[PDB]
Design a protein around this ligand. Structure first.
Ligand SMILES: CC(C)C[C@H](NC(=O)[C@@H](O)[C@H](N)Cc1ccccc1)C(=O)O
Ligand SMILES: [Zn+2]
Ligand SMILES: [Zn+2]
Lengths: 605, 323
């Protein structure tokens, strides 16, 4: 019901002034000022947010909305068929419209991710913005300011005009870049140089406590190496400068969100201080950084929408996210954020997920999972393994691994997926506007690296129900299962003594015995068990992770079922599970006769 | 009954005291042999006087007495080997430290077992005298001398006998010894004074009040155990059904016929098992292990009450009546 945005000039400047001082209530106070055009005027609250691929704009957290034209309140009417659109009537001869409101950010995780704490805050300008309908967002010149808690430091890719006391005024910027230029602020801050030169890269760290900022030299070097390895892959940087934003916290809501010249990232307080325990999540900065090339600069044409209030088409997210998931893990190994053994066991877990952990592939394609952002909005799902769940990430990753192996085979290892990366994202160094692409562009660039029917290859994997893990064998390794723990599973389990048993009993458990996941058609599923039931005892003994694992091993090769005493709501029963395969965890093993292209792929350049 | 109990001791215990208990200083041992008078008859008068004074209703006092009677009819299997007299040694033996089986080791039964004997003494005094004398006459004769005197006036066993004989001639020495040195019934005073101990599924008023608010489950006369609302067993009756399933205090009843434990859940299952041949299935936690036991108990919920014997004179109500 809101008129379509037009690629026409916007006269004047959209001023967005935010007071971010009410940490106790977690309220962002907002004033938006813009020229007022006589007649009906519709203002938009951003709905579809770039990088979320879904209508995540928190419309019901916009409160206290009062709109004044030249100082006189004008009543507003919401469009009942577009609840993000507010309509007012501007009198003839008017000059200026001011909208004031408050963004009531989450006071608990049940409302969304927390954005204010006693020590830090995360300002996402889309949550504090109203903008006129009828214009391509990039045509609206904007200028933002923020009043910070007293004395706090801040970081953002957006250039500062002046700080007066605790009020930071930024230089004017196009409105789409404003939304794409989030800010972290906090009292415990460290700025770390990752790459000097004409297109510099910095790491901005905020923490709950100052002791978490003590990054050691080798740990900083791994982040600096990430930047160096991206240069080798792409040969260009799509920014004039880049600002990593990293929150080390137990209070701010978790985040990984890419932008052209920055990314919003969260880690635990021990990101640096316990480097060897916090490794499984360290592909995060590599992942989001890669999006500066793959997602921000190059974007699918159906995803690159003209404003924030028309729907996004996610059809090509298996490139956007899929190949970024691939490069995040590859680049973690190439830079030293991960060890080679860590990256290899992680890849083994991905391969196992599609060989045995995704029975839903029998009926649903990876391509259809590009609709999961809008279908589910990351709300809880009963069977991620059977409904599927954004597999354009990891399923896409496996496809790109096979693409790499095929490029090598076609060219006697003279070309690889690195050549696609440079060809598709390496043009136009320094540009950070949007360069759209279609499916045919992907095929054409791949064909330019090595001639082959890439259109049929891509569609057969993304529209099919068959194996996605062919890149493992083609690049010289084989997926196996044994009772040796997977490094990723072990690290993810060991803090609370949880039990991941996907490939043995077909479920995962918390240390409490509560079932946290059940594999469709697996042994636990076939006993009627669901997530939320509790394993009370194993063969009569009070549950623990060691107890149930010992029982699985004890049942290997026998005919005596494992007796699980189960609590289902307010009832207790004993189920007999005839599982005798023992503990099974995925790993990769070399195929001795074939060249090891996998290790070449994961090797630093 | 607390203030009635301790007040009665001003007469029975402080003023009149057994000679072996009335020691010359605080640092030579006390002889407790006569505590079934000191505490036993005071336990008796504490409850009687609660009814006479209105601290308790008559219905409350009657259900309390029913619980005492049931305790010695069915709740004290230890009487098969231990006498009430020997429990006067429990203060020094145990110092009220925790014991596994109050019902089998016995536990200061000179209180409530003594109370039951004194009820029977009352009934016998009435029977010997065509209801012209009662235990009230022993109270006045034994403790009613020397108004205003609060020095200690010691007594021996023979003094108890002679004063009882003065109320109504009878071989009181053999009577007292037969009850305090015996292993047989102590509840004869109930029927002699016109009532009968019965059990049914109607809650005992004392048990109900003691159960309430915390949602506990006293099941002594059905499953032979008591439980907290959590399912933790708080008591087990020797040779009862729970005992015969190997259960001990501290074990936990996790489920009843598969349903998560509650006091209502286990009570409903007991009622559902009344008159059938389907055992009650209890899921039990014993330390860190779980097992299911089958209890073949089909008597239903059983709580003690007193009921009139219609043909007999109601002396019990006279005893509990305000004077
Ligand atoms: C902490 C990490 C798990 C974060 C990780 N982030 C990403 O993949 C980003 O590149 C995504 N662009 C973040 C995203 C995608 C879809 C809907 C909402 C948010 C994610 O999976 O959300
Ligand atoms: Zn991503
Ligand atoms: Zn007393």
């Amino acid at each position: 019901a809101t008129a379509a945005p037009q690629d026409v000039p916007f006269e004047g400047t959209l001023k967005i002034d935010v007071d971010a001082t009410d940490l106790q209530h977690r309220i962002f106070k907002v004033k938006t000022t813009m020229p007022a055009t006589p007649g009906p005027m519709t203002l938009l609250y951003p709905q579809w947010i770039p990088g979320n691929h879904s209508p995540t704009g928190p419309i019901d957290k916009l409160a206290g909305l009062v709109i004044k034209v030249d100082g006189k309140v004008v009543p507003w009417t919401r469009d009942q068929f577009d609840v993000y659109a507010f309509k007012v009537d501007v009198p003839q001869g008017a000059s200026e419209l001011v909208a004031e409101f408050k963004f009531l950010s989450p006071q608990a995780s049940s409302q969304g991710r927390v954005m204010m704490t006693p020590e830090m805050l995360n300002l996402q300008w889309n949550t504090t913005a109203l903008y006129p309908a009828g214009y391509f967002a990039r045509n609206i010149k904007a200028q933002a300011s923020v009043t910070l808690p007293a004395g706090w430091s801040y970081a953002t890719a957006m250039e500062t005009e002046r700080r007066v006391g605790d009020t930071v005024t930024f230089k004017p910027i196009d409105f789409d870049d404003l939304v794409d230029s989030p800010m972290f602020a906090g009292k415990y801050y460290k700025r770390v140089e990752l790459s000097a030169g004409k297109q510099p890269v910095y790491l901005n760290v905020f923490a709950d406590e100052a002791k978490s900022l003590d990054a050691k030299p080798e740990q900083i070097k791994a982040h600096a190496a990430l930047v160096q390895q991206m240069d080798k892959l792409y040969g260009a940087r799509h920014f004039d400068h880049y600002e990593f934003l990293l929150a080390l916290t137990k209070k701010l809501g978790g985040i990984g969100l890419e932008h052209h010249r920055s990314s919003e990232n969260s880690g635990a307080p021990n990101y640096f201080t316990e480097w060897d325990k916090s490794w499984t999540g360290r592909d995060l900065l590599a992942h989001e950084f890669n999006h500066s090339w793959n997602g921000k600069y190059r974007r699918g044409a159906d995803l690159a929408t003209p404003n924030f209030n028309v729907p996004m088409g996610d059809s090509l997210l298996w490139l956007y996210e899929g190949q970024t998931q691939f490069w995040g893990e590859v680049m973690s190994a190439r830079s030293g954020l991960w060890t080679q053994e860590q990256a290899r066991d992680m890849l083994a877990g991905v391969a196992a997920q599609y060989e045995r952990g995704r029975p839903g592939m029998a009926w649903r394609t990876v391509q259809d999972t590009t609709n999961d952002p809008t279908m589910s909005m990351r709300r809880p799902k009963a069977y991620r393994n059977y409904q599927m769940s954004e597999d354009y990430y990891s399923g896409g990753q496996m496809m790109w691994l096979e693409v790499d192996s095929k490029l090598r085979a076609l060219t006697n290892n003279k070309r690889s997926i690195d050549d696609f990366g440079k060809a598709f994202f390496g043009m136009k160094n320094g540009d950070w506007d949007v360069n759209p692409y279609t499916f045919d562009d992907i095929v054409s660039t791949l064909n330019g690296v090595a001639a082959f029917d890439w259109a049929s290859f891509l569609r057969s994997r993304m529209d099919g129900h068959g194996s996605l893990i062919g890149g493992i064998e083609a690049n010289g390794w084989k997926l196996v299962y044994n009772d040796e723990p997977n490094l990723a599973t072990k690290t993810d389990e060991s803090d609370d003594k949880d039990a991941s048993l996907t490939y043995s009993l077909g479920m995962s458990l918390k240390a409490s015995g509560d079932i946290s996941d059940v594999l469709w058609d697996g042994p636990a599923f076939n006993a009627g068990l669901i997530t939320g039931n509790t394993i009370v005892a194993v063969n009569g003994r009070a549950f623990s992770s060691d107890v149930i694992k010992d029982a699985i091993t004890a049942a290997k090769g026998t005919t005596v079922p494992i007796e699980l005493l189960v609590k289902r709501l307010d009832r207790y029963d004993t189920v007999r599970i005839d599982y005798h395969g023992g503990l099974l965890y995925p790993h990769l093993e070399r195929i001795a006769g074939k060249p090891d292209r996998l290790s070449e792929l994961y090797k630093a350049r």
